[PDB]
Short mmCIF file of C-alpha atoms and ligand atoms in Angstrom, two decimals:
data_model
loop_
_atom_site.label_atom_id
_atom_site.label_comp_id
_atom_site.label_asym_id
_atom_site.label_seq_id
_atom_site.Cartn_x
_atom_site.Cartn_y
_atom_site.Cartn_z
CA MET A 5 19.64 -31.74 -39.14
CA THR A 6 20.14 -35.09 -37.43
CA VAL A 7 18.57 -38.55 -37.39
CA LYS A 8 16.54 -39.05 -34.17
CA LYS A 9 17.51 -42.69 -33.62
CA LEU A 10 19.77 -45.21 -35.35
CA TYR A 11 18.91 -48.80 -34.49
CA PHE A 12 21.06 -51.86 -35.16
CA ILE A 13 18.70 -54.76 -35.78
CA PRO A 14 19.90 -58.36 -35.90
CA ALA A 15 18.42 -60.11 -38.94
CA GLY A 16 19.73 -63.65 -38.66
CA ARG A 17 23.25 -64.94 -39.27
CA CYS A 18 25.34 -66.51 -42.00
CA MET A 19 28.22 -69.00 -41.96
CA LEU A 20 31.12 -68.01 -44.17
CA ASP A 21 34.55 -69.57 -44.54
CA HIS A 22 37.13 -67.58 -42.58
CA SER A 23 39.06 -66.98 -45.81
CA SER A 24 36.20 -64.62 -46.73
CA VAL A 25 37.17 -62.26 -43.84
CA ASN A 26 40.90 -62.63 -44.40
CA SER A 27 41.90 -63.80 -47.86
CA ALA A 28 45.23 -65.18 -46.51
CA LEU A 29 43.60 -67.73 -44.18
CA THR A 30 43.50 -71.42 -45.03
CA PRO A 31 39.95 -72.43 -46.03
CA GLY A 32 38.30 -74.93 -43.69
CA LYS A 33 36.92 -73.06 -40.66
CA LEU A 34 33.46 -71.49 -40.95
CA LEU A 35 32.53 -68.35 -38.98
CA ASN A 36 28.99 -67.65 -37.79
CA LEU A 37 28.69 -63.99 -38.79
CA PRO A 38 25.95 -61.48 -37.89
CA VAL A 39 23.52 -60.23 -40.54
CA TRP A 40 22.33 -56.68 -39.85
CA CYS A 41 19.69 -54.26 -40.93
CA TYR A 42 19.51 -50.69 -39.65
CA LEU A 43 16.49 -48.58 -38.89
CA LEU A 44 16.76 -44.80 -39.01
CA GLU A 45 14.02 -42.74 -37.38
CA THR A 46 14.11 -39.34 -39.11
CA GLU A 47 12.03 -36.21 -39.22
CA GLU A 48 10.80 -37.26 -42.69
CA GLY A 49 9.91 -40.84 -41.60
CA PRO A 50 11.57 -44.20 -40.99
CA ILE A 51 14.28 -45.45 -43.33
CA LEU A 52 15.42 -49.09 -43.48
CA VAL A 53 18.98 -49.95 -44.52
CA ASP A 54 19.13 -53.48 -46.00
CA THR A 55 16.46 -56.16 -45.70
CA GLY A 56 18.01 -59.42 -44.54
CA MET A 57 17.87 -62.82 -46.25
CA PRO A 58 15.34 -64.32 -48.66
CA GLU A 59 12.50 -66.58 -47.52
CA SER A 60 14.26 -69.47 -49.29
CA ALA A 61 16.97 -69.26 -46.59
CA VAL A 62 14.53 -69.95 -43.76
CA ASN A 63 15.50 -73.18 -41.98
CA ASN A 64 17.60 -73.98 -45.04
CA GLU A 65 21.34 -73.93 -44.31
CA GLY A 66 21.87 -75.92 -47.53
CA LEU A 67 20.33 -73.18 -49.69
CA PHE A 68 23.51 -73.03 -51.81
CA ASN A 69 23.97 -76.75 -52.25
CA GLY A 70 24.47 -77.42 -55.96
CA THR A 71 25.83 -73.95 -56.68
CA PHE A 72 29.36 -72.59 -57.11
CA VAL A 73 29.32 -71.53 -53.44
CA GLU A 74 28.21 -74.88 -51.95
CA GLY A 75 29.67 -75.31 -48.47
CA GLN A 76 31.07 -71.78 -48.49
CA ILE A 77 27.94 -69.86 -47.49
CA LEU A 78 25.28 -71.27 -45.15
CA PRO A 79 22.48 -68.90 -44.06
CA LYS A 80 21.27 -69.19 -40.45
CA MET A 81 17.75 -67.81 -40.67
CA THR A 82 14.56 -68.62 -38.77
CA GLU A 83 10.98 -67.54 -39.62
CA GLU A 84 11.52 -64.69 -37.09
CA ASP A 85 14.35 -63.25 -39.19
CA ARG A 86 12.14 -62.50 -42.20
CA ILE A 87 12.23 -58.71 -42.59
CA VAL A 88 8.43 -58.39 -42.49
CA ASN A 89 8.35 -60.21 -39.17
CA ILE A 90 11.26 -58.13 -37.80
CA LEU A 91 9.48 -54.92 -38.84
CA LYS A 92 6.13 -56.01 -37.40
CA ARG A 93 7.77 -56.72 -34.02
CA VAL A 94 9.48 -53.31 -34.09
CA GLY A 95 6.19 -51.59 -34.99
CA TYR A 96 6.08 -51.13 -38.80
CA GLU A 97 4.59 -52.53 -41.98
CA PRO A 98 6.50 -52.26 -45.31
CA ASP A 99 4.34 -49.40 -46.62
CA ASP A 100 5.22 -47.33 -43.51
CA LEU A 101 8.80 -46.91 -44.66
CA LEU A 102 9.96 -43.71 -46.31
CA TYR A 103 12.86 -45.36 -48.17
CA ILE A 104 14.71 -48.61 -48.31
CA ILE A 105 18.47 -48.18 -48.83
CA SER A 106 20.23 -51.18 -50.37
CA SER A 107 23.92 -51.05 -49.55
CA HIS A 108 24.24 -53.64 -52.27
CA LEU A 109 22.24 -56.58 -53.69
CA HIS A 110 24.09 -59.52 -52.15
CA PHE A 111 21.71 -62.10 -50.72
CA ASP A 112 22.09 -61.17 -47.02
CA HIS A 113 21.48 -57.49 -47.75
CA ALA A 114 18.66 -57.50 -50.29
CA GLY A 115 16.93 -60.84 -49.80
CA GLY A 116 13.90 -59.13 -48.29
CA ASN A 117 13.53 -56.47 -51.00
CA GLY A 118 10.43 -58.09 -52.55
CA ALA A 119 8.44 -57.31 -49.40
CA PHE A 120 8.59 -53.57 -50.29
CA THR A 121 6.51 -53.04 -53.40
CA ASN A 122 5.67 -49.34 -52.91
CA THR A 123 8.60 -47.87 -50.95
CA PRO A 124 11.36 -46.43 -53.16
CA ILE A 125 14.46 -48.67 -52.96
CA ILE A 126 17.61 -46.60 -53.30
CA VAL A 127 20.39 -48.53 -55.03
CA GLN A 128 23.44 -47.68 -57.11
CA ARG A 129 23.14 -48.00 -60.86
CA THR A 130 26.34 -50.02 -61.07
CA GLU A 131 24.96 -52.44 -58.46
CA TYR A 132 21.55 -52.79 -60.15
CA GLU A 133 23.16 -53.43 -63.52
CA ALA A 134 25.59 -55.99 -62.04
CA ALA A 135 22.72 -57.84 -60.38
CA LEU A 136 21.04 -58.28 -63.76
CA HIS A 137 23.78 -60.71 -64.95
CA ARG A 138 26.43 -61.69 -62.42
CA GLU A 139 26.16 -65.19 -61.02
CA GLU A 140 26.57 -64.26 -57.37
CA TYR A 141 23.14 -62.55 -57.43
CA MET A 142 19.98 -64.31 -56.33
CA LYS A 143 16.81 -63.61 -58.31
CA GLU A 144 15.15 -62.58 -55.02
CA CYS A 145 17.54 -59.61 -54.87
CA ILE A 146 16.77 -58.15 -58.30
CA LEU A 147 13.01 -58.50 -58.68
CA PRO A 148 11.97 -56.53 -61.77
CA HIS A 149 8.94 -54.51 -60.72
CA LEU A 150 9.90 -52.95 -57.40
CA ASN A 151 9.96 -49.13 -57.08
CA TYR A 152 13.71 -48.68 -57.62
CA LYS A 153 15.21 -45.24 -57.11
CA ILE A 154 18.46 -45.68 -58.99
CA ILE A 155 21.26 -43.33 -57.98
CA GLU A 156 24.83 -42.68 -59.21
CA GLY A 157 27.58 -41.87 -56.74
CA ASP A 158 27.32 -40.07 -53.42
CA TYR A 159 23.82 -39.04 -52.41
CA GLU A 160 21.93 -37.33 -49.62
CA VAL A 161 18.79 -39.30 -48.79
CA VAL A 162 17.47 -36.86 -46.15
CA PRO A 163 19.40 -34.48 -43.92
CA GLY A 164 21.68 -36.52 -41.70
CA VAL A 165 21.68 -39.56 -44.02
CA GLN A 166 24.49 -39.59 -46.59
CA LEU A 167 25.39 -42.43 -48.96
CA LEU A 168 29.07 -42.81 -49.84
CA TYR A 169 29.86 -44.73 -53.03
CA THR A 170 32.27 -47.49 -52.00
CA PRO A 171 32.49 -50.00 -54.87
CA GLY A 172 34.82 -53.01 -54.91
CA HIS A 173 33.31 -55.60 -52.61
CA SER A 174 30.47 -55.43 -55.16
CA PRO A 175 30.30 -53.27 -58.30
CA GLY A 176 27.97 -50.65 -56.77
CA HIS A 177 28.46 -51.08 -53.04
CA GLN A 178 27.60 -48.02 -50.92
CA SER A 179 28.28 -47.17 -47.28
CA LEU A 180 26.41 -44.79 -44.95
CA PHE A 181 27.50 -41.70 -43.16
CA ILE A 182 24.82 -40.75 -40.64
CA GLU A 183 24.57 -37.85 -38.20
CA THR A 184 22.52 -38.82 -35.16
CA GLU A 185 21.13 -36.64 -32.35
CA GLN A 186 22.70 -38.79 -29.62
CA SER A 187 26.06 -39.70 -31.14
CA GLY A 188 26.98 -37.30 -33.93
CA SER A 189 28.85 -38.77 -36.90
CA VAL A 190 28.48 -42.50 -37.55
CA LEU A 191 30.04 -44.45 -40.41
CA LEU A 192 28.38 -47.79 -41.35
CA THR A 193 30.95 -49.31 -43.68
CA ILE A 194 28.61 -52.19 -44.50
CA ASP A 195 30.62 -54.60 -46.71
CA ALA A 196 33.25 -52.03 -47.66
CA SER A 197 34.92 -53.85 -44.69
CA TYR A 198 33.56 -56.99 -43.05
CA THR A 199 35.81 -56.52 -39.99
CA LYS A 200 37.85 -53.88 -38.18
CA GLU A 201 41.06 -55.44 -39.51
CA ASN A 202 39.79 -55.20 -43.13
CA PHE A 203 39.42 -51.47 -42.55
CA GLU A 204 42.27 -50.47 -40.22
CA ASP A 205 44.85 -53.01 -41.42
CA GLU A 206 43.62 -53.34 -45.01
CA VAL A 207 43.41 -57.11 -44.61
CA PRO A 208 41.90 -58.39 -47.90
CA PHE A 209 38.46 -60.00 -47.83
CA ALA A 210 35.88 -61.38 -50.26
CA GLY A 211 34.96 -59.02 -53.06
CA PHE A 212 34.33 -58.58 -56.76
CA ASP A 213 37.37 -56.28 -57.21
CA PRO A 214 39.80 -56.18 -54.29
CA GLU A 215 41.87 -53.35 -55.80
CA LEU A 216 38.76 -51.18 -56.05
CA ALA A 217 37.72 -52.28 -52.55
CA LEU A 218 41.04 -51.05 -51.21
CA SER A 219 40.62 -47.68 -52.94
CA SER A 220 37.16 -47.36 -51.35
CA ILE A 221 38.67 -48.11 -47.92
CA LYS A 222 41.31 -45.38 -48.55
CA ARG A 223 38.47 -43.01 -49.48
CA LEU A 224 36.58 -43.84 -46.28
CA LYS A 225 39.80 -43.25 -44.31
CA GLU A 226 39.95 -39.71 -45.71
CA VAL A 227 36.35 -39.16 -44.57
CA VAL A 228 37.27 -40.59 -41.14
CA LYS A 229 40.29 -38.24 -40.83
CA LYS A 230 37.99 -35.25 -41.45
CA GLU A 231 34.90 -36.34 -39.54
CA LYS A 232 36.14 -38.65 -36.72
CA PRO A 233 32.96 -40.76 -36.72
CA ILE A 234 32.25 -43.87 -34.67
CA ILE A 235 32.68 -46.71 -37.16
CA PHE A 236 30.74 -49.98 -37.49
CA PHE A 237 31.79 -52.82 -39.78
CA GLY A 238 29.70 -55.19 -41.86
CA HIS A 239 30.16 -58.63 -40.28
CA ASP A 240 32.44 -58.31 -37.26
CA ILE A 241 31.90 -60.94 -34.54
CA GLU A 242 34.16 -59.13 -32.10
CA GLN A 243 32.52 -55.75 -32.56
CA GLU A 244 29.03 -57.30 -32.36
CA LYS A 245 29.70 -58.10 -28.66
CA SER A 246 29.87 -54.41 -27.79
CA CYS A 247 27.22 -53.02 -30.21
CA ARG A 248 24.13 -51.36 -28.74
CA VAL A 249 21.26 -53.19 -30.45
CA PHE A 250 17.51 -52.72 -30.67
CA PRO A 251 15.78 -51.51 -28.51
CA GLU A 252 18.85 -49.43 -27.69
CA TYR A 253 19.87 -46.91 -30.32
CA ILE A 254 22.69 -44.50 -31.08
C1 C6L B 301 31.46 -60.31 -54.08
C2 C6L B 301 32.07 -61.18 -52.99
C3 C6L B 301 30.96 -61.40 -51.97
C4 C6L B 301 30.09 -62.64 -52.22
C5 C6L B 301 28.56 -62.68 -52.21
C6 C6L B 301 27.77 -62.64 -50.90
O1 C6L B 301 26.58 -62.70 -50.94
N1 C6L B 301 28.40 -62.45 -49.77
C7 C6L B 301 27.74 -62.29 -48.48
C8 C6L B 301 28.50 -63.13 -47.44
C9 C6L B 301 27.65 -63.60 -46.25
O2 C6L B 301 27.36 -62.55 -45.33
C10 C6L B 301 27.69 -60.84 -47.99
O3 C6L B 301 27.57 -59.90 -48.77
O4 C6L B 301 27.70 -60.57 -46.81
ZN1 ZN B 302 28.30 -58.31 -49.77
ZN1 ZN B 303 27.44 -58.63 -46.14
#
């Protein structure tokens, strides 16, 4: 069985130093990177992958002033980029969603999680437990009373929607392998590779455990050899130019 439609939905942007996309680069040039969420229309109902940035980021590029990442990360988020507003424009309210899938709990991927207080939020155990104590996690991304559906390892959410455990960039990062009616096999690496060169050329990039990130890239490459999917990376300015985005779908 296949997903009916896979939508790429812009959810604001984020400035990062270029050394975060290629660890060999000299710090000092910021890159204005895309932030994405994905909407899957399935037989069982709509599924949202990631939830954008927290409300604290709205019109607040200096959000991380005074923290260990001051000047390194600057969110570019307007009121329109709040996930609830994105969803309402698309045609949904939070309680309409079948599942939320959190690729991981970094601030640009889980900042909107608090909006979903009934929908099960599928997240890896190792990610959830990291978010409880590691300093790179915002409180907005680990709210205590949401309906978490904690999983361990690879997982089938519904037919056509597979989660691949790809730790390294974060302790419980997961990627998506989706089968769509229009396109067949699609791999969303999410932050298992920010850019094409992180994936193809194994160019190192920001992560909790680069050695583990590399092993997850090698694992994805084995999947790619078998399945020959179309592949989309987490924060790739070049690829963004050619991506079909909402209202188009793949
Ligand atoms: C563990 C190394 C990654 C740092 C934390 C972070 O939130 N990174 C953002 C960078 C801005 O997009 C992300 O996940 O995308
Ligand atoms: Zn991340
Ligand atoms: Zn990211």
